[PDB]
Amino acid sequence: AQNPNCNIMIFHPTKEEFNDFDKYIAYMESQGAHRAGLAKIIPPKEWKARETYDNISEILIATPLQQVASGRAGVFTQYHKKKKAMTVGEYRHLANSKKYQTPPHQNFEDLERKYWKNRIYNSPIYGADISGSLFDENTKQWNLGHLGTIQDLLEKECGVVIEGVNTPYLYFGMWKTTFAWHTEDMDLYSINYLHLGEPKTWYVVPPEHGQRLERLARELFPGSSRGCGAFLRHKVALISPTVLKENGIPFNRITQEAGEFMVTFPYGYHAGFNHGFNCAEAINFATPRWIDYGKMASQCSCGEARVTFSMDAFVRILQPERYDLWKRGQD
Ligand SMILES: NC(=S)Nc1ccc(F)cc1
Numbered sequence: 001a002q003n004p005n006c007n008i009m010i011f012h013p014t015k016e017e018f019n020d021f022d023k024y025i026a027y028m029e030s031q032g033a034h035r036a037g038l039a040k041i042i043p044p045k046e047w048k049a050r051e052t053y054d055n056i057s058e059i060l061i062a063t064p065l066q067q068v069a070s071g072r073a074g075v076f077t078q079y080h081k082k083k084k085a086m087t088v089g090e091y092r093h094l095a096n097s098k099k100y101q102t103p104p105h106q107n108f109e110d111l112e113r114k115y116w117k118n119r120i121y122n123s124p125i126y127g128a129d130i131s132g133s134l135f136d137e138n139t140k141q142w143n144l145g146h147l148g149t150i151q152d153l154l155e156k157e158c159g160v161v162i163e164g165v166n167t168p169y170l171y172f173g174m175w176k177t178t179f180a181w182h183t184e185d186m187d188l189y190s191i192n193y194l195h196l197g198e199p200k201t202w203y204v205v206p207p208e209h210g211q212r213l214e215r216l217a218r219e220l221f222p223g224s225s226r227g228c229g230a231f232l233r234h235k236v237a238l239i240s241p242t243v244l245k246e247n248g249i250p251f252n253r254i255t256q257e258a259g260e261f262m263v264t265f266p267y268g269y270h271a272g273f274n275h276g277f278n279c280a281e282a283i284n285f286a287t288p289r290w291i292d293y294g295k296m297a298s299q300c301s302c303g304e305a306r307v308t309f310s311m312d313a314f315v316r317i318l319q320p321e322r323y324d325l326w327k328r329g330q331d
């Protein structure tokens with residue numbers, strides 16, 4: 001078996017290899033990349049997402065989110081407080097202000113130490129889940145707005161035609177902005193391109209060990225666990241690498257820099273933080289290997305998770321027994 005230790009693998013496709021997206025995902029998996037839950041893909045030197053990022057300041061962040069923490073440094077939740085709208089130019093200025101800017105640091109490891117020591121004592125503001133794309137329409141390779149849709153994948157594999165669409169989202173981040181431990185909706189893949197700015201550090205649990213993370217989360221957030229059998233779907237819980245190590249949870253970490261893609265694989269739990277002002281673009285996708293994960297995906301039915309329109313069809317077709325209860329939490 002390839003990659004038995006479930007290490008995060010890094011790929012350097014040639015421009016020829018970068019033509020066929022599906023084929024290269026399949027190649028990565030033939031080398032065992034999915035066992036880690038996360039892979040890095042460095043694009044060919046000849047490739048670019050767009051010409052410049054000089055004219056993005058007028059993009060609107062309609063609902064910036066202030067991420068307010070509760071708990072202890074290594075085990076905490078965050079809730080999202082809605083703030084007034086601001087443009088990307090205004091947001092960048094805020095990110096670079098004395099209150100919010102990245103502190104002096106020696107290297108990525110030093111900054112990581114500072115993040116886990118001090119994150120809970122600050123409330124950074126995130127521009128998340130903004131529908132849109134920064135890929136040039138003439139970019140033909142690995143354009144996240146031009147991927148085959150999940151609905152067409154389900155139709156190709158299972159013969160059922162369903163409603164729904166599948167478009168990218170933009171994320172504008174600043175120092176300490178945080179993404180909580182989660183897998184994707186319906187345990188789908190995700191792909192994330194860091195367009196511009198400071199790095200993003202990722203943590204990931206191998207899919208074959210996801211239930212170990214779930215068990216620890218139930219122990220560490222006992223009230224949340226009683227309230228919902230799938231509360232990590234709420235995307236609000238953080239557990240530090242130190243606490244994961246103390247509890248013997250297998251995981252890996254890696255830092256993504258501007259110009260690099262990350263792919264998360266079905267049922268690969270991940271979490272992380274931004275180093276400073278940046279912009280990422282991400283979208284979910286599927287392959288034939290995903291279908292069995294979609295059939296088995298846990299669901300939140302307590303009402304907190306609240307998902308896109310398009311997940312309805314996924315649950316309806318792949319999980320018909322669960323559909324009645326799930327839809328109740330969504331109305
Ligand atoms: N490459 C960068 S950081 N360009 C940029 C970012 C924000 C903005 F408002 C205008 C331009």
Ligand SMILES: O=C(O)CNC(=O)C(=O)O
Pocket residue numbers: 171178179190191192264280282283
């Ligand atoms: O970048 C972020 O804030 C979160 N991204 C993801 O969880 C992802 O791409 O799957």
Ligand code: NI
Pocket residue numbers: 182183184190264270
């Ligand atoms: Ni994700």
Ligand SMILES: [Zn+2]
Pocket residue numbers: 227228229230231233234300301302303304305
């Ligand atoms: Zn729930």
